[PDB]
C-alpha cells in the first residue's frame, strides 16, 4: 500500500548536476517529513539533509552546506534534490526517507540510483 520509488541511474559529466525525484504513495504527503541519505561506494553513509513538506525549512550538513538544495511539491506529492557543480569525486547511491511525528523514523526506503561520473 505504502512504498517509495526512485528508479534510474542518470550518469552525467561535470559542468552540470542531475536533480533527484522522490515520489511517495500510501500516506498523506503533507503531514510527514522527507529525509535524504547518501550511500558512497566507499561504504560512506554520510547524511545529506532534511526538508519539511509544509514549509521550505531545510537543514544541511557543514561539509554539504552550499551544495545541496532541497525542494518539494505538494501537488504531485513528490520530493526533489538539486545539486550544483558535481565533479569526478562525488559518486554514490541516493536514498530518500520519510519520518514522522514520533521517532522520525527511516522505516521506508527507496530502491536507489547508480550515480557514476567520469571525466
Amino acid at each position: 500500500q505504502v512504498q517509495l520509488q526512485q528508479p534510474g541511474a542518470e550518469l552525467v559529466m561535470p559542468g552540470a548536476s542531475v536533480k533527484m525525484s522522490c515520489k511517495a504513495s500510501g500516506y498523506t504527503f503533507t503531514d510527514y517529513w522527507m529525509h535524504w541519505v547518501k550511500q558512497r561506494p566507499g561504504q560512506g553513509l554520510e547524511w545529506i539533509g532534511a526538508i519539511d513538506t509544509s514549509d521550505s525549512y531545510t537543514t544541511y550538513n557543514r561539509k554539504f552546506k552550499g551544495k545541496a538544495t532541497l525542494t518539494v511539491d505538494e501537488s504531485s506529492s513528490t520530493a526533489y534534490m538539486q545539486l550544483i557543480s558535481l565533479t569526478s569525486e562525488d559518486s554514490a547511491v541516493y536514498y530518500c526517507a520519510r519520518g514522522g511525528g514520533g521517532n522520525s523514523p527511516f522505516a521506508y526506503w527507496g530502491q536507489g540510483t547508480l550515480v557514476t561520473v567520469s571525466a
Binding site: 561504504q43 521517532n103 526506503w109
Partner: protein, 109 residues
C-alpha cells in the same frame, strides 16, 4: 557533529552464538536511537527503534538493551541471511549521523 562510535568494525561468527554490538556516543541522546539493516542488494530496512521497541513483521530474534552509557543490539539466533551491515543512528538532534558499522563473516577453512 556528534560522532557515533560503533565497535567492533568486524566479526566472525557461525550459526547461533548470540553476539551483541555496542555503540557509544559522546553526548546523551536519551532513548532515541535507530538500527538499520543493509542488504547486499542495496536495500536498507529498519530493525530496532527506541530500544526495546521492534518493527511489526520482523521476527523476534532481534532485540536490544541499554546499560545507560551504551546502546546494544542483541540477536538471539543468527542465520545465513543475517550477514549485513549494522549501523546505530541518533535522530534525537540535528544533524543525524551514522555509525562505523560491522561486517558479519562466517568461520571457514
Amino acid at each position: 557533529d556528534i560522532q557515533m562510535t560503533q565497535s567492533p568494525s568486524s566479526l566472525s561468527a557461525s550459526l547461533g552464538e548470540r553476539v551483541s554490538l555496542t555503540c557509544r556516543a559522546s553526548q546523551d541522546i536519551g532513548s532515541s536511537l535507530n538500527w538499520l539493516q543493509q542488504e547486499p542488494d542495496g536495500t536498507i530496512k529498519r530493525l530496532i527503534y527506541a530500544t526495546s521497541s521492534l518493527d511489526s513483521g520482523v521476527p523476534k530474534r532481534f532485540s536490544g538493551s541499554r546499560s545507560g552509557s551504551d546502546y546494544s543490539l542483541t540477536i538471539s539466533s543468527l542465520e545465513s541471511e543475517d550477514f549485513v551491515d549494522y549501523y546505530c543512528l541518533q535522530y534525537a538532534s540535528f544533524p543525524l549521523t551514522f555509525g562505523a558499522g560491522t561486517k558479519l563473516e562466517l568461520k571457514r577453512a
